[PDB]
Amino acid sequence: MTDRYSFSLTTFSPSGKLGQIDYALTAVKQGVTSLGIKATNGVVIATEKKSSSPLAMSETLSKVSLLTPDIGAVYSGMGPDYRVLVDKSRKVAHTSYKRIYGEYPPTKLLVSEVAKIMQEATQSGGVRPFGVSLLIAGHDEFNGFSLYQVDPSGSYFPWKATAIGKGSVAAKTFLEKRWNDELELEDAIHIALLTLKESVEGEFNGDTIELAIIGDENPDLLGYTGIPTDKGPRFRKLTSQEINDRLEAL
Template sequence: MADRYSFSLTTFSPTGKLVQIEYALNAVNQGVTALGIKATNGIVLATEKKSSSPLIDPPSLSKVSLITPNIGMVYSGMGPDYRVLVDKARKVSHTNYKRIYNEYPPTRILVQDVARVMQEATQSGGVRPYGVSLLVAGWDEGIEPDVEADNVSGGAGAEEPKPSGKTGGILKGGPMLYQVDPSGSYYPWKATAIGKSATSAKTFLEKRYTEGLELEDAVHIALLTLKETIEGEMNGETVEIGIIGPPAHHLMGVEGVEGAQGPRFRKLSPQEIEDYLTNFGVLEAAIREGSAAASTALAGRKR
């Protein structure tokens, strides 16, 4: 009886579960750990680059992908399934949405489209669920709510301006972090982890995460979390990090274009990761001992 429901791709078991989704989650839980941390001024995506052979060229291994200039993605699970979803996400962003609106989609809209593709695979005949979970990070520019004219009177006793109702103050900008599961479910997170050591990584993040976290602090907390889960040496070749941060104008490829800004998402080079790891011992002790010491250490690194 159980085998019948295990074999069927779209039939619910008597307990109300789609067994193939459970199997897809097992594939995710066997993958390497990946995590995301949202800061006040950006987001960090970090994962382990695990090679099955020392003969593989390390630069060819990549788990963090650029979708749009302001959106990036990392996964845990089956690599081939991930490549298909990356292609679909890029197609939605660069052709479908941009062709209509002349801009890239907000993070939430892109996540909804990817989640819809993953959900359709759970109820369509002849296909199986995607064996990956995704962490999608992006920066939305947002739309400032219009202000009623009679509210802008100025003066010391003037009331705070109120939204006009045209936007309702709903479309806010800033960093956004989402997790998408094989079932097509998606959730916004402040910090989360997926993969083999997701449970222990989440426990670690719950202890270390604080409101008002800066991007530099988030990078070091990500490295601390990976250190708890990685077996072996951490270096620029075994760790991959992508960040959402200030516009990187040097990556535009052109200069002198009025109003243009560089991408907010970029991957750290192996040398940049090595630089973080060089000061890792001091910063690890500082973060563990207290935020004041950590701030002092980070301030020294920024200089």
Template sequence: MGDSQYSFSLTTFSPSGKLVQIEHALTAVGSGQTSLGIKVIPVIAAANGVVIATEKKLPSILVDETSVQKIQILTPNIGVVYSGMGPDSRVLVRKSRKQAEQYQRLYKEPIPVTQLVRETAAVMQEFTQSGGVRPFGVSLLVAGYDDKGPQLYQVDPSGSYFSWKASAMGKNVSNAKAFLEKRYTDDMELDDAVHTAILTLKEGVLTPAEIEDYLQEVE
């Protein structure tokens, strides 16, 4: 028996130990536009931070590009980029902003990056075990800065999350991660990280003209 007969059951494990609906959610992420992040903490005294980049393709030239936002601000010190289904990401962004606001009101200080990631991941995990819902078809790269310095986390539809020095998701993720592994160094500075992020997108995604437009937009 294969796993296909379990694909319509959200909470039943297949004989191979998988929740097949999560596999479908990861497929949705893999078909989404490429996004990546690079954390920068130079060994020597220099500017640090997190660089996030993504491909932004419009479904039609008639779409107003200002209405399509791949990178969202959760708090003044935390941002997020997604790959996968845009509507799912908006739900998670709204829930994350609400959680951050509740923390701010209660403790009178910004929510730590790790805690906001944990709360968001918990919401995603709940949607893998509840009736009447489905897993979120989106993965998130959460970039932020707090008392522990720059932070970069990837959160997947299963609710699993890890801290990364650099990571990528979406289309061509294998090539993108392989390229990042070759280019990433612990003494990388912000300018190098921006350059590496653009080259990573160029590796399998952007044309030279699109890269030129991206650089002009950044400047």
């Protein structure tokens, strides 16, 4: 028994590379494309649901996850690594923030916490880095809307729009053409849907595309009335139908 691996599995090579982190980014490159676009009144994050069998039920595997009622995440790379990260992210938003200050963390802060968890897997004994890159979109009262990228090393950067994974270079070019500081949310949804069309070979519909937004408060999605200062979540996953509505207008 007993973990006898109390030394780093990620070390510096003579050139200064950190091999394991490089290798994890390469796992990310092979991953299905995901992307995020920031508008003036919202953010959209989107990816392809790429089922392993047509016998699988792809609504059971969610690639776009609520972290707090105002923050959402998507990934490219290793799916199971993402899933546990979402567990740890959700929890830390409570233990490191909500249980202390009575409110949900602001985006940059929660990203920061996720980044820390990632960094540590790059230095602690007997683990390998996480093989994912994340895009975290969210809102908070004092910073407005924001979109962040987090890489295996634990580095994070704020973006106006970006894409990660398989077709990320093509898609970042496509995004530089179409982005401006005046886009309304629906316009950004539109650009997301277009950008993604380039990456998908197969069927391209509301059942094969996962997409969520950080927009207005949805008081209908809160579950209770009577506290004027609780307005509902800003995170909303679109429905299969909502996506298809926007594809005919494509």
